[PDB]
Amino acid sequence: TSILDIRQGPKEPFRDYVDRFYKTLRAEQASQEVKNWMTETLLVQNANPDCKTILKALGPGATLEEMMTACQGV
Amino acid sequence: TSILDIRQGPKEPFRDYVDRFYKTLRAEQASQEVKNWMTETLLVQNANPDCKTILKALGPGATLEEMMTACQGV
Amino acid sequence: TSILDIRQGPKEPFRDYVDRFYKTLRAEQASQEVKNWMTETLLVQNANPDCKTILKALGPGATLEEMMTACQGV
Amino acid sequence: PIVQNLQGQMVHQAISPRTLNAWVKVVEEKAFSPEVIPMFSALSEGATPQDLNTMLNTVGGHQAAMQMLKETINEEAAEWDRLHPVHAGPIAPGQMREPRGSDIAGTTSTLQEQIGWMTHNPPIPVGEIYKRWIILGLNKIVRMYSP
Amino acid sequence: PIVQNLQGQMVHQAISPRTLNAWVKVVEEKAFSPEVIPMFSALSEGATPQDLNTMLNTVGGHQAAMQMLKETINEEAAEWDRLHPVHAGPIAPGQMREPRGSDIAGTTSTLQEQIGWMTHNPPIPVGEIYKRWIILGLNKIVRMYSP
Amino acid sequence: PIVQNLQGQMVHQAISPRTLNAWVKVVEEKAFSPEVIPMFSALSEGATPQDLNTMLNTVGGHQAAMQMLKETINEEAAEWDRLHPVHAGPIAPGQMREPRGSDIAGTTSTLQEQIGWMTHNPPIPVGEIYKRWIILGLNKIVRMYSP
């Protein structure tokens, strides 16, 4: 399965999705800079509308514990 | 559970009771002399009437194999 | 789960609650003095009314075996 | 632990994983039962304080008991400090320092320090002092946890 | 790991498969539970950075946590480089080079280099520096993964 | 593998059955998962080409992958021969012959020859050259077998 095919379900907790992401990211062998680009970009983009909304409110500069606690009720 | 709370059932084999006794006696830490006193005293006292009757007939000086074979049919 | 969220049920034995407390206290990393403060304070405070009543009668200076034997019938 | 090597000296060697796991499994299976104390005693043969904290810290579950033990270990340690006062004047260059309750509990001492005391001549049995505190605290637990 | 041989020198020996598997099994069974940290600490006794990356790289699952740890290891490493600047002028022929955050993380150093630093006199405890970063990052994880 | 003996020389010793079985079990359980590569790397510490063919030949199952790897090993070997031409004139009596791709793959060389190259001064790391080919071919597999 390709990294672009990794997406969050409509009922799937973000948490279970983030695990899937760094597992697939774990099978990507690209430069770190590209993998940083993938992190800030693709993760949020394939996140579900309800959490996506939430993550837009965190702004930039956000870290994984704060994202992970931010989308917990969703 | 306290050692005073160890008693023989009305249908319980003595054998299963004697096992319970030296297990609980195994969790008592008292002087040996006191534990000897407990042995000759409490064991018979909380034994059931049918076996109790039997044990009274063995008299004093009795040892565990003879008590254990004495109350076997009970 | 946070340490403030640890509370004793209305039918839950204290014992099962005290186990939960030092497990969660085991995941707190605070200074010992603060953790001492948590011990004397929060434990009793989130204890149920029936045992809470009991613990108030032990007074201060009390140790865990005496608290644990004090709220046993509750 | 500190074991004797083939050459005829006392050197430290690490404790084994299936020893570790055997300690875990005992606790899992027999909880507070009295057989735990001889069992402990055998598996603590030649053990350091450091290894004894490792064994206590690696427990899961029975946290009320684990706290009661801790508090017994500190009481017994407080008592060590009380009974044995610190000694007169500065520490000699030619000598190594006397232990406190917290060195016996392994807390304030380093491994090399724990090996200095035990391997040196006369040797001091800081394992056996902690061992009694553990066994004493084990009696407290056993007596309480009797139903 | 780097262990002491019978002859009385410190030499490298490989870590054992049932040690490896015991590391695996701990992670399988107790995931983020606190007992993992003393457990880690025991199984990391005398371990190299190289062996510590081996242990981290051999994890399966919990990839969000594994990434959080990585990023903590690099932060702690960035901090090593910040706090300890490089030293004045060229490296002496008679001496060996000071480590950076990435040598501590094992990344820029070779094994023989990791053995030079630890076995040499004075020795430098690059294991124990990485160990704190691992334990610190373990606290971060434990605190987050509390529910 | 070729290991260092107590006397202080490098001698060959055979690999252990529960090492063999641990290799088998990894493959059984984690198939093409990435953790297989560090795992491999640890269990290949000090290993010969001969031992590496033994490990590859003892696989059961995943024969499409095993063939893809073989064909990668031969490609990487063909590339070794290309990049490193044979040397000028006849082989010296005082010296031992340079390896080819097939000596690295273990095929055209004998064990004593594999020990000559590795133990001799300078030593040549024919294990590490095959190891990269294995790891490279492992990447090919991992990337394909991603779904």
PDB file of all heavy atoms in Angstrom, chain A residues 14-67, unseen atoms left out:
ATOM      1  N   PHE A  14      -8.188   9.270  15.206  1.00  0.00           N
ATOM      2  CA  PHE A  14      -6.980   9.845  14.690  1.00  0.00           C
ATOM      3  C   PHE A  14      -5.773   9.124  15.066  1.00  0.00           C
ATOM      4  O   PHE A  14      -4.927   8.776  14.305  1.00  0.00           O
ATOM      5  N   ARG A  15      -5.750   8.819  16.362  1.00  0.00           N
ATOM      6  CA  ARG A  15      -4.721   7.976  16.998  1.00  0.00           C
ATOM      7  C   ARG A  15      -4.438   6.673  16.192  1.00  0.00           C
ATOM      8  O   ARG A  15      -3.245   6.295  16.072  1.00  0.00           O
ATOM      9  N   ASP A  16      -5.471   5.967  15.715  1.00  0.00           N
ATOM     10  CA  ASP A  16      -5.273   4.728  15.072  1.00  0.00           C
ATOM     11  C   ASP A  16      -4.656   4.923  13.603  1.00  0.00           C
ATOM     12  O   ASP A  16      -3.711   4.268  13.160  1.00  0.00           O
ATOM     13  N   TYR A  17      -5.111   6.009  13.051  1.00  0.00           N
ATOM     14  CA  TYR A  17      -4.572   6.646  11.856  1.00  0.00           C
ATOM     15  C   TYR A  17      -3.138   7.199  11.879  1.00  0.00           C
ATOM     16  O   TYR A  17      -2.422   6.946  10.946  1.00  0.00           O
ATOM     17  N   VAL A  18      -2.751   7.823  12.950  1.00  0.00           N
ATOM     18  CA  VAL A  18      -1.399   8.274  13.111  1.00  0.00           C
ATOM     19  C   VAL A  18      -0.364   7.134  13.250  1.00  0.00           C
ATOM     20  O   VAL A  18       0.761   7.100  12.754  1.00  0.00           O
ATOM     21  N   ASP A  19      -0.813   6.096  13.928  1.00  0.00           N
ATOM     22  CA  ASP A  19      -0.080   4.817  13.983  1.00  0.00           C
ATOM     23  C   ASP A  19       0.147   4.190  12.657  1.00  0.00           C
ATOM     24  O   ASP A  19       1.200   3.815  12.280  1.00  0.00           O
ATOM     25  N   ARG A  20      -0.957   4.149  11.849  1.00  0.00           N
ATOM     26  CA  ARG A  20      -0.838   3.690  10.432  1.00  0.00           C
ATOM     27  C   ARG A  20       0.089   4.508   9.580  1.00  0.00           C
ATOM     28  O   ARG A  20       0.928   3.997   8.805  1.00  0.00           O
ATOM     29  N   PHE A  21       0.071   5.827   9.793  1.00  0.00           N
ATOM     30  CA  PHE A  21       0.931   6.771   9.088  1.00  0.00           C
ATOM     31  C   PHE A  21       2.371   6.569   9.358  1.00  0.00           C
ATOM     32  O   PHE A  21       3.104   6.323   8.339  1.00  0.00           O
ATOM     33  N   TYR A  22       2.829   6.537  10.613  1.00  0.00           N
ATOM     34  CA  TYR A  22       4.265   6.331  10.860  1.00  0.00           C
ATOM     35  C   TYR A  22       4.774   4.902  10.666  1.00  0.00           C
ATOM     36  O   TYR A  22       5.933   4.630  10.463  1.00  0.00           O
ATOM     37  N   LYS A  23       3.868   3.903  10.577  1.00  0.00           N
ATOM     38  CA  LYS A  23       4.179   2.565  10.074  1.00  0.00           C
ATOM     39  C   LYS A  23       4.517   2.533   8.563  1.00  0.00           C
ATOM     40  O   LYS A  23       5.533   2.083   8.106  1.00  0.00           O
ATOM     41  N   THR A  24       3.609   3.138   7.764  1.00  0.00           N
ATOM     42  CA  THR A  24       3.874   3.324   6.315  1.00  0.00           C
ATOM     43  C   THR A  24       5.030   4.238   5.975  1.00  0.00           C
ATOM     44  O   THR A  24       5.901   3.914   5.106  1.00  0.00           O
ATOM     45  N   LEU A  25       5.182   5.368   6.739  1.00  0.00           N
ATOM     46  CA  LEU A  25       6.302   6.318   6.753  1.00  0.00           C
ATOM     47  C   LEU A  25       7.580   5.536   7.140  1.00  0.00           C
ATOM     48  O   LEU A  25       8.645   5.706   6.524  1.00  0.00           O
ATOM     49  N   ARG A  26       7.429   4.589   8.100  1.00  0.00           N
ATOM     50  CA  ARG A  26       8.522   3.651   8.490  1.00  0.00           C
ATOM     51  C   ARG A  26       8.993   2.824   7.270  1.00  0.00           C
ATOM     52  O   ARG A  26      10.161   2.522   7.124  1.00  0.00           O
ATOM     53  N   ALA A  27       8.119   2.472   6.259  1.00  0.00           N
ATOM     54  CA  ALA A  27       8.498   1.778   4.961  1.00  0.00           C
ATOM     55  C   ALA A  27       8.819   2.689   3.843  1.00  0.00           C
ATOM     56  O   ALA A  27       9.301   2.285   2.812  1.00  0.00           O
ATOM     57  N   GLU A  28       8.826   4.028   4.055  1.00  0.00           N
ATOM     58  CA  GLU A  28       9.335   4.928   3.071  1.00  0.00           C
ATOM     59  C   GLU A  28      10.823   5.156   3.432  1.00  0.00           C
ATOM     60  O   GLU A  28      11.124   5.078   4.623  1.00  0.00           O
ATOM     61  N   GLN A  29      11.643   5.193   2.395  1.00  0.00           N
ATOM     62  CA  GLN A  29      13.074   5.343   2.547  1.00  0.00           C
ATOM     63  C   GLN A  29      13.572   6.752   2.129  1.00  0.00           C
ATOM     64  O   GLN A  29      14.737   7.067   2.393  1.00  0.00           O
ATOM     65  N   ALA A  30      12.740   7.719   1.621  1.00  0.00           N
ATOM     66  CA  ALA A  30      13.089   9.164   1.255  1.00  0.00           C
ATOM     67  C   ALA A  30      13.897  10.023   2.216  1.00  0.00           C
ATOM     68  O   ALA A  30      13.977   9.783   3.424  1.00  0.00           O
ATOM     69  N   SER A  31      14.601  11.071   1.708  1.00  0.00           N
ATOM     70  CA  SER A  31      15.345  12.041   2.488  1.00  0.00           C
ATOM     71  C   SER A  31      14.444  12.640   3.598  1.00  0.00           C
ATOM     72  O   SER A  31      13.229  12.659   3.613  1.00  0.00           O
ATOM     73  N   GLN A  32      15.057  13.043   4.707  1.00  0.00           N
ATOM     74  CA  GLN A  32      14.400  13.400   5.969  1.00  0.00           C
ATOM     75  C   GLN A  32      13.479  14.611   5.799  1.00  0.00           C
ATOM     76  O   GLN A  32      12.404  14.742   6.348  1.00  0.00           O
ATOM     77  N   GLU A  33      13.932  15.565   4.960  1.00  0.00           N
ATOM     78  CA  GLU A  33      13.384  16.845   4.526  1.00  0.00           C
ATOM     79  C   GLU A  33      12.080  16.562   3.779  1.00  0.00           C
ATOM     80  O   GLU A  33      11.043  17.235   3.996  1.00  0.00           O
ATOM     81  N   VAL A  34      12.092  15.536   2.896  1.00  0.00           N
ATOM     82  CA  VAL A  34      10.896  15.086   2.228  1.00  0.00           C
ATOM     83  C   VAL A  34       9.849  14.396   3.134  1.00  0.00           C
ATOM     84  O   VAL A  34       8.668  14.677   3.105  1.00  0.00           O
ATOM     85  N   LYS A  35      10.425  13.575   4.024  1.00  0.00           N
ATOM     86  CA  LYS A  35       9.628  12.964   5.047  1.00  0.00           C
ATOM     87  C   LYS A  35       9.023  13.953   6.060  1.00  0.00           C
ATOM     88  O   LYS A  35       7.921  13.771   6.481  1.00  0.00           O
ATOM     89  N   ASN A  36       9.731  15.088   6.390  1.00  0.00           N
ATOM     90  CA  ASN A  36       9.192  16.263   7.130  1.00  0.00           C
ATOM     91  C   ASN A  36       8.042  16.969   6.442  1.00  0.00           C
ATOM     92  O   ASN A  36       6.968  17.260   7.065  1.00  0.00           O
ATOM     93  N   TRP A  37       8.193  17.107   5.108  1.00  0.00           N
ATOM     94  CA  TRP A  37       7.184  17.642   4.204  1.00  0.00           C
ATOM     95  C   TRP A  37       5.936  16.764   4.199  1.00  0.00           C
ATOM     96  O   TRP A  37       4.839  17.262   4.323  1.00  0.00           O
ATOM     97  N   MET A  38       6.087  15.443   4.156  1.00  0.00           N
ATOM     98  CA  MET A  38       5.034  14.494   4.254  1.00  0.00           C
ATOM     99  C   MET A  38       4.302  14.518   5.547  1.00  0.00           C
ATOM    100  O   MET A  38       3.073  14.416   5.623  1.00  0.00           O
ATOM    101  N   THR A  39       5.020  14.644   6.620  1.00  0.00           N
ATOM    102  CA  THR A  39       4.483  14.817   7.973  1.00  0.00           C
ATOM    103  C   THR A  39       3.576  15.982   8.125  1.00  0.00           C
ATOM    104  O   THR A  39       2.364  15.794   8.437  1.00  0.00           O
ATOM    105  N   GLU A  40       4.040  17.201   7.845  1.00  0.00           N
ATOM    106  CA  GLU A  40       3.179  18.360   7.991  1.00  0.00           C
ATOM    107  C   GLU A  40       2.063  18.446   6.995  1.00  0.00           C
ATOM    108  O   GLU A  40       1.108  19.167   7.090  1.00  0.00           O
ATOM    109  N   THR A  41       2.193  17.780   5.889  1.00  0.00           N
ATOM    110  CA  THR A  41       1.237  17.920   4.807  1.00  0.00           C
ATOM    111  C   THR A  41       0.244  16.874   4.757  1.00  0.00           C
ATOM    112  O   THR A  41      -0.953  17.161   4.815  1.00  0.00           O
ATOM    113  N   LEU A  42       0.651  15.593   4.556  1.00  0.00           N
ATOM    114  CA  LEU A  42      -0.255  14.547   4.109  1.00  0.00           C
ATOM    115  C   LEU A  42      -1.137  14.095   5.239  1.00  0.00           C
ATOM    116  O   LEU A  42      -2.334  13.858   5.111  1.00  0.00           O
ATOM    117  N   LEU A  43      -0.585  14.010   6.461  1.00  0.00           N
ATOM    118  CA  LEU A  43      -1.258  13.644   7.691  1.00  0.00           C
ATOM    119  C   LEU A  43      -2.587  14.456   7.897  1.00  0.00           C
ATOM    120  O   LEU A  43      -3.665  13.945   8.100  1.00  0.00           O
ATOM    121  N   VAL A  44      -2.510  15.832   7.848  1.00  0.00           N
ATOM    122  CA  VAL A  44      -3.639  16.597   8.017  1.00  0.00           C
ATOM    123  C   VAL A  44      -4.635  16.559   6.951  1.00  0.00           C
ATOM    124  O   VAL A  44      -5.792  16.520   7.149  1.00  0.00           O
ATOM    125  N   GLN A  45      -4.157  16.557   5.698  1.00  0.00           N
ATOM    126  CA  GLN A  45      -4.893  16.447   4.460  1.00  0.00           C
ATOM    127  C   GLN A  45      -5.746  15.187   4.438  1.00  0.00           C
ATOM    128  O   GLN A  45      -6.954  15.239   4.053  1.00  0.00           O
ATOM    129  N   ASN A  46      -5.270  14.008   4.865  1.00  0.00           N
ATOM    130  CA  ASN A  46      -6.124  12.850   4.789  1.00  0.00           C
ATOM    131  C   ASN A  46      -6.821  12.527   6.022  1.00  0.00           C
ATOM    132  O   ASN A  46      -7.459  11.447   6.159  1.00  0.00           O
ATOM    133  N   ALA A  47      -6.795  13.515   7.036  1.00  0.00           N
ATOM    134  CA  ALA A  47      -7.435  13.420   8.270  1.00  0.00           C
ATOM    135  C   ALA A  47      -8.952  13.657   8.010  1.00  0.00           C
ATOM    136  O   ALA A  47      -9.250  14.324   7.017  1.00  0.00           O
ATOM    137  N   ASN A  48      -9.929  13.126   8.795  1.00  0.00           N
ATOM    138  CA  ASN A  48     -11.349  13.311   8.580  1.00  0.00           C
ATOM    139  C   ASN A  48     -11.812  14.756   8.850  1.00  0.00           C
ATOM    140  O   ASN A  48     -11.235  15.523   9.613  1.00  0.00           O
ATOM    141  N   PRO A  49     -12.947  15.242   8.254  1.00  0.00           N
ATOM    142  CA  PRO A  49     -13.439  16.638   8.353  1.00  0.00           C
ATOM    143  C   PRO A  49     -13.521  16.986   9.842  1.00  0.00           C
ATOM    144  O   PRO A  49     -13.136  18.102  10.145  1.00  0.00           O
ATOM    145  N   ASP A  50     -14.057  16.205  10.748  1.00  0.00           N
ATOM    146  CA  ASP A  50     -14.284  16.649  12.106  1.00  0.00           C
ATOM    147  C   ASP A  50     -12.986  16.970  12.794  1.00  0.00           C
ATOM    148  O   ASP A  50     -12.812  18.037  13.358  1.00  0.00           O
ATOM    149  N   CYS A  51     -11.994  16.078  12.727  1.00  0.00           N
ATOM    150  CA  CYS A  51     -10.644  16.360  13.219  1.00  0.00           C
ATOM    151  C   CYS A  51      -9.829  17.316  12.474  1.00  0.00           C
ATOM    152  O   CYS A  51      -9.070  18.081  13.061  1.00  0.00           O
ATOM    153  N   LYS A  52     -10.004  17.321  11.162  1.00  0.00           N
ATOM    154  CA  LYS A  52      -9.391  18.266  10.267  1.00  0.00           C
ATOM    155  C   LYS A  52      -9.690  19.683  10.664  1.00  0.00           C
ATOM    156  O   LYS A  52      -8.794  20.515  10.758  1.00  0.00           O
ATOM    157  N   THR A  53     -10.944  19.943  10.962  1.00  0.00           N
ATOM    158  CA  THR A  53     -11.446  21.189  11.503  1.00  0.00           C
ATOM    159  C   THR A  53     -10.644  21.569  12.780  1.00  0.00           C
ATOM    160  O   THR A  53     -10.107  22.683  12.876  1.00  0.00           O
ATOM    161  N   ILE A  54     -10.523  20.581  13.737  1.00  0.00           N
ATOM    162  CA  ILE A  54      -9.837  20.693  15.021  1.00  0.00           C
ATOM    163  C   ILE A  54      -8.336  21.112  14.833  1.00  0.00           C
ATOM    164  O   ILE A  54      -7.745  22.022  15.446  1.00  0.00           O
ATOM    165  N   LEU A  55      -7.658  20.443  13.893  1.00  0.00           N
ATOM    166  CA  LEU A  55      -6.292  20.592  13.611  1.00  0.00           C
ATOM    167  C   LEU A  55      -6.029  21.914  12.958  1.00  0.00           C
ATOM    168  O   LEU A  55      -4.994  22.535  13.185  1.00  0.00           O
ATOM    169  N   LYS A  56      -6.970  22.405  12.125  1.00  0.00           N
ATOM    170  CA  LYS A  56      -6.800  23.712  11.578  1.00  0.00           C
ATOM    171  C   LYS A  56      -6.703  24.763  12.731  1.00  0.00           C
ATOM    172  O   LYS A  56      -5.980  25.754  12.606  1.00  0.00           O
ATOM    173  N   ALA A  57      -7.452  24.571  13.870  1.00  0.00           N
ATOM    174  CA  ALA A  57      -7.486  25.510  15.022  1.00  0.00           C
ATOM    175  C   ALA A  57      -6.172  25.416  15.812  1.00  0.00           C
ATOM    176  O   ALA A  57      -5.847  26.358  16.460  1.00  0.00           O
ATOM    177  N   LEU A  58      -5.420  24.285  15.795  1.00  0.00           N
ATOM    178  CA  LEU A  58      -4.159  24.284  16.503  1.00  0.00           C
ATOM    179  C   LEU A  58      -3.108  25.270  15.909  1.00  0.00           C
ATOM    180  O   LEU A  58      -2.096  25.540  16.513  1.00  0.00           O
ATOM    181  N   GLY A  59      -3.288  25.700  14.644  1.00  0.00           N
ATOM    182  CA  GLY A  59      -2.306  26.461  13.872  1.00  0.00           C
ATOM    183  C   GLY A  59      -1.051  25.690  13.559  1.00  0.00           C
ATOM    184  O   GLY A  59      -0.934  24.464  13.821  1.00  0.00           O
ATOM    185  N   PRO A  60       0.050  26.325  13.126  1.00  0.00           N
ATOM    186  CA  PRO A  60       1.254  25.689  12.772  1.00  0.00           C
ATOM    187  C   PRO A  60       2.088  25.649  14.038  1.00  0.00           C
ATOM    188  O   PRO A  60       1.679  26.133  15.102  1.00  0.00           O
ATOM    189  N   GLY A  61       3.275  24.976  14.000  1.00  0.00           N
ATOM    190  CA  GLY A  61       4.115  24.869  15.135  1.00  0.00           C
ATOM    191  C   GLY A  61       3.682  23.823  16.069  1.00  0.00           C
ATOM    192  O   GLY A  61       4.345  23.619  17.135  1.00  0.00           O
ATOM    193  N   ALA A  62       2.608  23.110  15.844  1.00  0.00           N
ATOM    194  CA  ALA A  62       2.028  22.107  16.751  1.00  0.00           C
ATOM    195  C   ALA A  62       2.820  20.766  16.867  1.00  0.00           C
ATOM    196  O   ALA A  62       3.367  20.307  15.861  1.00  0.00           O
ATOM    197  N   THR A  63       2.890  20.105  18.014  1.00  0.00           N
ATOM    198  CA  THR A  63       3.585  18.841  18.121  1.00  0.00           C
ATOM    199  C   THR A  63       2.659  17.661  18.405  1.00  0.00           C
ATOM    200  O   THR A  63       1.432  17.776  18.456  1.00  0.00           O
ATOM    201  N   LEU A  64       3.186  16.463  18.235  1.00  0.00           N
ATOM    202  CA  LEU A  64       2.300  15.277  18.199  1.00  0.00           C
ATOM    203  C   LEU A  64       1.459  15.013  19.443  1.00  0.00           C
ATOM    204  O   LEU A  64       0.257  14.701  19.273  1.00  0.00           O
ATOM    205  N   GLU A  65       1.940  15.129  20.641  1.00  0.00           N
ATOM    206  CA  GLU A  65       1.138  15.043  21.866  1.00  0.00           C
ATOM    207  C   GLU A  65      -0.010  16.042  21.854  1.00  0.00           C
ATOM    208  O   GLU A  65      -1.124  15.737  22.114  1.00  0.00           O
ATOM    209  N   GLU A  66       0.161  17.304  21.490  1.00  0.00           N
ATOM    210  CA  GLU A  66      -0.884  18.265  21.353  1.00  0.00           C
ATOM    211  C   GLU A  66      -1.809  17.902  20.226  1.00  0.00           C
ATOM    212  O   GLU A  66      -3.018  18.018  20.385  1.00  0.00           O
ATOM    213  N   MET A  67      -1.409  17.382  19.070  1.00  0.00           N
ATOM    214  CA  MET A  67      -2.375  16.961  18.049  1.00  0.00           C
ATOM    215  C   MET A  67      -3.147  15.783  18.554  1.00  0.00           C
ATOM    216  O   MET A  67      -4.359  15.614  18.302  1.00  0.00           O
TER     217      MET A  67
END
